[PDB]
Design a protein around this motif. Structure first.
Motif, PDB file in Angstrom:
ATOM      1  N   UNK A   1      -3.285  -9.247  -9.608  1.00 50.03           N
ATOM      2  CA  UNK A   1      -2.463  -8.357 -10.406  1.00 50.03           C
ATOM      3  C   UNK A   1      -2.116  -7.076  -9.672  1.00 50.03           C
ATOM      4  N   UNK A   2      -1.441  -7.212  -8.535  1.00 51.21           N
ATOM      5  CA  UNK A   2      -1.054  -6.056  -7.734  1.00 51.21           C
ATOM      6  C   UNK A   2       0.134  -6.391  -6.836  1.00 51.21           C
ATOM      7  N   UNK A   3       1.150  -5.535  -6.865  1.00 45.07           N
ATOM      8  CA  UNK A   3       2.345  -5.741  -6.057  1.00 45.07           C
ATOM      9  C   UNK A   3       2.293  -4.902  -4.784  1.00 45.07           C
ATOM     10  N   UNK A   4       2.445  -5.562  -3.640  1.00 46.97           N
ATOM     11  CA  UNK A   4       2.412  -4.861  -2.369  1.00 46.97           C
ATOM     12  C   UNK A   4       3.798  -4.529  -1.853  1.00 46.97           C
ATOM     13  N   UNK A   5       3.881  -4.161  -0.578  1.00 45.57           N
ATOM     14  CA  UNK A   5       5.157  -3.811   0.035  1.00 45.57           C
ATOM     15  C   UNK A   5       5.247  -4.362   1.454  1.00 45.57           C
ATOM     16  N   UNK A   6       6.452  -4.752   1.856  1.00 45.98           N
ATOM     17  CA  UNK A   6       6.673  -5.300   3.189  1.00 45.98           C
ATOM     18  C   UNK A   6       6.773  -4.185   4.225  1.00 45.98           C
TER      19      UNK A   6
END
Ligand SMILES: [Zn+2]
Ligand SMILES: [Zn+2]
Ligand SMILES: [Zn+2]
Ligand SMILES: [Zn+2]
Ligand SMILES: [Zn+2]
Ligand SMILES: [Zn+2]
Length: 143
Positions: A1-6
């Motif tokens: 439940x966590x959105x990362x970044x490129x």
């Protein structure tokens, strides 16, 4: 439940179309590794071995990626590969106040006016050193 970044950005570089070394529009083939690099200096820069500037004769265009031999202009786009084109050194550089010395058989940077070539020495020398420089050796006492 966590959105990362490129991540992992990148950059660009300049090579063909005239490098810091010379301003040409055709890469010289490398009969040493069968590779192509802007100029002779570039090859060594991106290689462990040094490439020749006299051996190689063929050249490739960067405007229309058309194959051809030693010349000053293309045969498909007629793109000036360099105001000055040498046959002996097989080098192509834009108008950079440079002149080719016959005594040395190599290309040099002028302005010839403020320069000259000595015989006894067998090399090119700037006017600033017209006489001050020595040609022949002589003198028993060392130090
Ligand atoms: Zn090579
Ligand atoms: Zn170069
Ligand atoms: Zn071309
Ligand atoms: Zn030359
Ligand atoms: Zn010379
Ligand atoms: Zn001299």
């Amino acid at each position: 439940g966590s959105s990362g970044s490129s991540g992992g950005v990148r950059n660009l570089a300049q090579g063909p179309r005239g490098c810091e070394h010379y301003d040409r529009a055709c890469l010289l083939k490398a009969p040493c590794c069968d590779k192509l690099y802007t100029c002779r200096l570039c090859h060594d820069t991106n290689e462990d071995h040094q490439l020749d500037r006299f051996k190689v004769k063929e050249v490739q265009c960067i405007n229309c990626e058309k194959l051809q031999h030693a010349q000053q202009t293309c045969e498909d786009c007629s793109t000036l590969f360099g105001e000055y084109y040498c046959s002996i050194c097989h080098l192509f550089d834009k108008d950079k106040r440079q002149y080719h010395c016959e005594s040395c058989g190599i290309c040099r940077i002028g302005p010839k006016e403020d320069f000259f070539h000595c015989l006894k020495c067998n090399l090119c020398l700037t006017t600033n050193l017209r006489g001050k420089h020595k040609c022949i050796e002589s003198g028993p006492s060392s130090g």
